[PDB]
Amino acid sequence: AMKTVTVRDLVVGEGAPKIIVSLMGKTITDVKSEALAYREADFDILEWRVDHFANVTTAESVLEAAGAIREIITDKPLLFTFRSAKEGGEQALTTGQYIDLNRAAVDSGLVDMIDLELFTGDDEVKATVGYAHQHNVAVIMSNHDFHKTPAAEEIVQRLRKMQELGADIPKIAVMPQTKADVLTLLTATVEMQERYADRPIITMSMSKTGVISRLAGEVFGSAATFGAVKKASAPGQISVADLRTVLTILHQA
Amino acid sequence: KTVTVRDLVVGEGAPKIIVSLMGKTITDVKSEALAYREADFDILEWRVDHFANVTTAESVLEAAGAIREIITDKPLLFTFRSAKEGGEQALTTGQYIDLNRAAVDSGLVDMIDLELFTGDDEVKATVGYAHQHNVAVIMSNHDFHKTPAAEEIVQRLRKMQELGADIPKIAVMPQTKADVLTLLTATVEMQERYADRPIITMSMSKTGVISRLAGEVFGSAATFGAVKKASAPGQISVADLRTVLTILHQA
Ligand SMILES: [Cl-]
Ligand SMILES: [Cl-]
Numbered sequence: 206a207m208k209t210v211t212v213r214d215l216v217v218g219e220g221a222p223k224i225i226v227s228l229m230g231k232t233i234t235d236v237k238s239e240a241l242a243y244r245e246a247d248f249d250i251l252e253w254r255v256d257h258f259a260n261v262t263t264a265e266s267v268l269e270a271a272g273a274i275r276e277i278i279t280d281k282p283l284l285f286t287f288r289s290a291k292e293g294g295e296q297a298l299t300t301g302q303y304i305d306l307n308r309a310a311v312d313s314g315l316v317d318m319i320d321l322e323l324f325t326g327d328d329e330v331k332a333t334v335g336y337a338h339q340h341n342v343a344v345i346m347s348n349h350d351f352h353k354t355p356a357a358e359e360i361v362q363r364l365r366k367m368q369e370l371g372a373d374i375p376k377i378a379v380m381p382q383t384k385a386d387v388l389t390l391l392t393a394t395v396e397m398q399e400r401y402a403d404r405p406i407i408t409m410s411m412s413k414t415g416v417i418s419r420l421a422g423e424v425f426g427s428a429a430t431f432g433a434v435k436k437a438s439a440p441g442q443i444s445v446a447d448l449r450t451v452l453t454i455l456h457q458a
Numbered sequence: 459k460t461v462t463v464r465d466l467v468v469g470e471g472a473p474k475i476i477v478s479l480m481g482k483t484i485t486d487v488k489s490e491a492l493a494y495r496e497a498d499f500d501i502l503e504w505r506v507d508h509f510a511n512v513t514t515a516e517s518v519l520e521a522a523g524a525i526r527e528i529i530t531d532k533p534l535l536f537t538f539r540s541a542k543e544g545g546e547q548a549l550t551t552g553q554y555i556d557l558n559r560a561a562v563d564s565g566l567v568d569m570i571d572l573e574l575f576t577g578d579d580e581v582k583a584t585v586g587y588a589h590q591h592n593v594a595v596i597m598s599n600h601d602f603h604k605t606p607a608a609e610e611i612v613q614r615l616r617k618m619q620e621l622g623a624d625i626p627k628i629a630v631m632p633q634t635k636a637d638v639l640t641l642l643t644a645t646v647e648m649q650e651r652y653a654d655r656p657i658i659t660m661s662m663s664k665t666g667v668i669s670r671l672a673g674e675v676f677g678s679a680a681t682f683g684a685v686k687k688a689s690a691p692g693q694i695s696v697a698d699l700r701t702v703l704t705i706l707h708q709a
Contacts, residue, residue: 384646384676388639395635416709417672424665425635447705454702458667458694 210373210405212317212343213282215249217374218405221456222422223249223429224445225284227438228274229257236270240277246434248445252284252320254438255306256294261287262302264309271315284345285310286320292349293439304329311342318343320376323367334371345407346372349439354379354386354410360393364408365401374428376407378439381415390418391425398426405429411441419443420451461624461656463533463568463594466500468625469656472707473673474500474680476535477696478689479525480508487521491528497685498700502529503571505689506538506557507545513553515560522566535596536561537571543600544690555580562593569594571627574618585622596658597623600690605630605637605661611644615659616652625679627658629690631666638666642676645669649677656680663692670694671702 209218217223226248230236236258243251253274261267275283287306288294298306303325310316311333319337321330323346330346337344346367355363360377367375381387390410397406405428410418419430419441430452431438432445460469468474477499481487487509494502504525511517526534538557539545549557554576561567562584570588572581574597581597588595597618606614611628618626632638641661648657656679661669670681670692681703682689683696 384650385643387675388642388646392636392639395639399635413709414675416706417668417675420671421668424638424668441709443705443709447709451702451705454694454698455667458664458698 207402208404210343212250215282218428221452222427224448224452225250225252225429225431226434226445227252227254227431229254229436229438230270231257231259233266233270233273237273237277240274243434244277246445247449248432248434249281250284250429251278251281252286252438255285255287256289256296261296261298261306267306267309268313268315271310271313275315282317283315284318284320285316288320289322291324292322292347293351300326300329304333307333308336311337311340316342318345318373320345320347322346323348323363323370327370330370338371343373344371345374345376346370347376347378349378351380351411354381354389357389357393357396360390361397361401364393364397364406368401368404372404374405374407378409378411381410381412384414386410387415387418390415391421394425394427402426409441411439413441416441416443419448420455423452423455459655461594463501466533469679472703473678475696475699475703476501476503476680476682477685478503478505478537478682480505480687480689482508482510484517484521484524488524488528491525494529494685497696499683499696500532501535501569501680502532503535503537503689505546506536507540507547512538512547512549512557518557519560519564519566522561522564526566533568534566535569535571536567539571540573543573543598544602551577551580555584558584559587562588562591565591567593569596571596571598573597574599574614574621578621581621589622594624595622596625596627597621598627598629600629602631602662605632605640608640608644608647611641612648612652615644615648615657619652619655623655625656625658629660629662631691632661632663635665637661638669641666641669642672645676645678653677660692662690665692667692667694670699671706674703674706
């Protein structure tokens with residue numbers, strides 16, 4: 206049976222899917238103005254897309270920015286996410302730099318969760334998951350394909366490997382090229398959820414064509430969904446207000 | 459291609475909303491029609507099988523007239539849902555065909571619903587008759603216990619086209635979550651390979667609700683909502699249905 210994941214008092218895996226929004230700021234000044242602009246938006250988890258932050262290799266700066274968000278947004282769990290260039294991110298980093306950055310986030314005491322990419326390297330992932338858990342920081346383990354939708358079987362295999370590597374919440378986002386691809390993503394979601402999952406999972410088919418996948422998580426088994434405040438962090442994200450509207454209708458229908 | 463009934467263009471843009479009106483007497487029918495005046499829907503389906511005196515031709519056409527007098531700006535779809543497809547009363551094939559012919563000849567309805575499994579010759583003759591009077595035909599099939607394989611759902615939709623349906627329609631019942639996706643697969647396959655007109659598909663119950671919401675992407679041209687009482691499992695409130703369809707259209 207599926208256990209839930211509680212982050213800064215939000216319980217993920219129960220009830221209606223939770224809404225995650227991404228905050229993107231190049232400088233400390235932008236991060237602060239965006240955080241202020243997000244303050245009153247209707248979402249559940251705040252993801253900080255750190256790869257949008259210039260010169261992330263200056264430790265003191267990343268810390269300062271994290272502290273700035275944490276003081277403006279006091280009522281939401283914070284997810285620290287450096288999306289690698291490999292998986293659609295805005296910046297290149299070495300594996301070493303990537304792991305150091307996430308370990309720095311963990312020991313800061315400022316973040317509730319970190320995002321770690323499944324294909325970073327098994328050894329590095331196991332170690333960083335261990336380090337996170339030792340500091341009471343949850344891990345969303347992710348995989349993204351911005352060009353195509355892999356076969357359902359391959360999608361399920363990846364989500365299963367995320368569980369094996371210790372993810373608190375497995376997450377996969379794929380790009381549909383056809384309408385059938387959207388159904389392939391939902392099939393994988395259902396099969397994973399019904400046969401192998403023992404914790405919450407997050408799945409999505411990107412683009413306007415895949416939008417339905419961001420709304421039907423309650424029936425098909427995705428525990429959270431991404432929405433946009435102003436600009437999307439990945440294609441297909443709709444406004445958090447509209448997202449909450451639909452999720453509530455579906456929760457009570 | 460599209461199907462235009464009055465100023466409503468079916469097959470274009472956001473899926474159109476159909477709601478069912480159910481009443482046993484003329485007074486019930488008037489009461490419901492008045493209540494529906496404010497609801498936001500596109501096509502009014504009269505579930506004739508709920509009417510208590512369907513074998514009295516004078517009564518049925520008075521009820522239809524009553525509805526048309528009240529709802530003057532929406533196309534009216536005349537639907538006698540047979541007991542064998544989950545409806546409220548049983549009629550012989552002859553009575554059912556005669557009832558639909560009388561509806562067509564009345565000039566009061568814009569569309570009729572004919573069940574695919576009525577009998578090929580009777581269906582062809584009634585389709586021809588409706589068309590001769592400029593009445594559109596939604597051809598339907600329902601299964602309240604299971605979901606046929608995708609290939610059989612497609613075959614049925616294809617047969618509906620062959621028999622001259624203006625709009626093929628199929629409703630199936632999911633026993634599992636995978637069955638909901640099977641209905642959507644069949645909808646996509648039909649739409650992309652065989653359809654040359656609008657189609658309506660739905661997986662019933664709350665479990666299949668996605669199928670009532672995602673027609674713009676997957677290829678269903680209309681969807682049923684409920685004003686106060688559902689005409690089949692899984693229908694959601696018409697207001698909420700319009701909200702979701704609009705959000706999906708504007709995404
Ligand atoms: Cl996303
Ligand atoms: Cl229905």
